[PDB]
């Protein structure tokens, strides 16, 4: 019974082929929101896939498009589309970070920001001046900043049924890395860990212009192509069968994670997590159940001989409990009923 | 009688010490309007130099500055700013470009945008929905869009003033290249053009990330440090002595040019340019009086011959003739009351 504008961002489609972590959050999001009979809009990249109505500056995927160079001018382009429609909406649901804080105080609809990022020593001058805003975190170790103006905790949630579940690994061991080749991810870390153990390591992911040379002088050289072994950005269903024939995922973060959808994903799949406890890491696995949170390589190395020992099935079931899209939306829309009340 | 909200980068301090076109340009602007009884509202970094009121976001210059990685906290940071006491000026002057444009539709304020940069396949797609809006172009060659709103052609100024006149070059001839050290510039050309004439070239100009690369593997490796000097980003006293001892300011662009800031910055020392004739060179130079215009680097060289043949004090009286802070302002005033109207 509601107006929602939902506002992603252009680096990829809102149903993402593959990678892609924003974007696929707000696709599941709004195809249930529009089950549940309000009338969305959403602000996309043109070769979205929705439900919804579908407002468009650019057809494709920025990222991955070859004949753009600046992404910040089609992206203030359906700034502009969204604020300047403020009237037709109830509320505006922005996941494109601090970039709508200053469209905020120009408009009468009230503006929800779900943060999907890390806190930087930048980022938290924009967030300060705005702390009178409406934000929704992803989890509890995200909020760095306690002087803003939280509504609620909304934890990220997948489509569990579409993933495949696998009862037993692969018969010869491996273990799988899955995500961005970057330095935050600790995909080196991982590499470590497989010939620590005697495992090999099947990897997916993307190598993007950020960490070209990060991959190039401590990733690439590891590749031998049988123990390590890299197949690149993969799609849903690359990346189900990846997870689910590894005895774990490896998930060494060295970085302040908000959430980590690759976690949630490994566990769907059957497959639990050898994380490091950082970031929300604590709060998305189990101990000692969905996964074991480690403080250290050796932690990690450790830890994989003790993964046979857990329930597979308990790690799917987990992922019902917690972060299904039933719950995320529903949480989501006491968020709306808050904003529109409280102003 | 009016109240201006001047709206600079952040990149460089609004008075820059070395590198800086636009924020230069809004330097003398901004003073100008004070001197002449405007209220003015100068957004900008914390360390610019101003009489006008001065609203910052960051203290200090973001390009140098080590500790920022995310230019666009600061930049939406002001861009809030001004939209958020839009209702206490009665124009704002925006030089950040098209992050301004979203912005416009929203305040009943009007903005005037000058236009500081090359039209491009992604940017004209912005200023396309945004076509109906006050816009200042610095040359007539960067109205590659000839559906929008130019409210004029404002040509830019320096301080010719603060510049010093040199009579005559340095005693050992050499040339100069002015400029960042891009593609664009083509510096790469310069030096080319160096060796092909028998003089010698001092370069300088800031090599920033986006052109280490090309610097580090079309330029570096042919710095003598005798033939090819090159100093790295000079201030304002070092680049005028560098421009007043050159017989000539090597301008060897490969790219469509805005403006041009080194060509009047050249011709008030008293420096002829040979520049090749892309973007607004043929605007910025009086071909055969204060330089030469030029099809190839092939022309380059044999403009170089013919240097002796100009006269250095016309150069130095053609920048005061055409580009002035008096008369740019004057225009840019004329904007206001048309934009006003
Ligand atoms: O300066 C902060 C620091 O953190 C990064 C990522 O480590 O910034 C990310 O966080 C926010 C919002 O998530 C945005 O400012 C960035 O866009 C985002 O990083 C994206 O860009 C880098 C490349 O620079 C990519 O490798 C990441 O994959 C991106 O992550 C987000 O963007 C995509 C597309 O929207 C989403 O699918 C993904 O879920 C997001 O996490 C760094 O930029 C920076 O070092
Ligand atoms: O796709 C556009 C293409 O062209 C550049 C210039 O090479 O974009 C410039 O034009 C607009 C507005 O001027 C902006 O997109 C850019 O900010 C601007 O380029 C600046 O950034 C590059 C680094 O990529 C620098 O070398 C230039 O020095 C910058 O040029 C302007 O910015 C400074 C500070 O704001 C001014 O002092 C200067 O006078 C301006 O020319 C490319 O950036 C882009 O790739
Ligand atoms: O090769 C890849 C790498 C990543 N992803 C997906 O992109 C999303 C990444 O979200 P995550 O939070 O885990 O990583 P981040 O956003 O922080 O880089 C996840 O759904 C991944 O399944 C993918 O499909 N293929
Ligand atoms: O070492 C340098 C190199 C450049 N500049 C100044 O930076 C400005 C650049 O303006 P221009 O239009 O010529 O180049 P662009 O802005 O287009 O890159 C000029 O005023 C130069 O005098 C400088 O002070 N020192």
Redesign the interface.
Known sequence: HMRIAQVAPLWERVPPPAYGGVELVVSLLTEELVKRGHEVTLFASGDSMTQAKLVS?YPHAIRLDP????Y???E??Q??EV??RANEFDVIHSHVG??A???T???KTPVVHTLHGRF????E??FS??RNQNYVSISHSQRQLRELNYIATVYNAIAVETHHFYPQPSDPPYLAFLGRLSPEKGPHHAIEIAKRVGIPLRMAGKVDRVDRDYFKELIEPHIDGEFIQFIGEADHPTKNALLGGAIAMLFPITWQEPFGLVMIESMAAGTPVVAIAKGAAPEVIEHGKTGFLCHSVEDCVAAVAQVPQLDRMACRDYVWQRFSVERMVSEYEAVYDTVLANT
């Open positions: 500056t004949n753009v160079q600046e910040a001018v089609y203030a382009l700034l502009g604020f300047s601090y970039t804080l200053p469209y105080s120009l408009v930087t020593a930048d980022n001058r924009i001046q705005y």
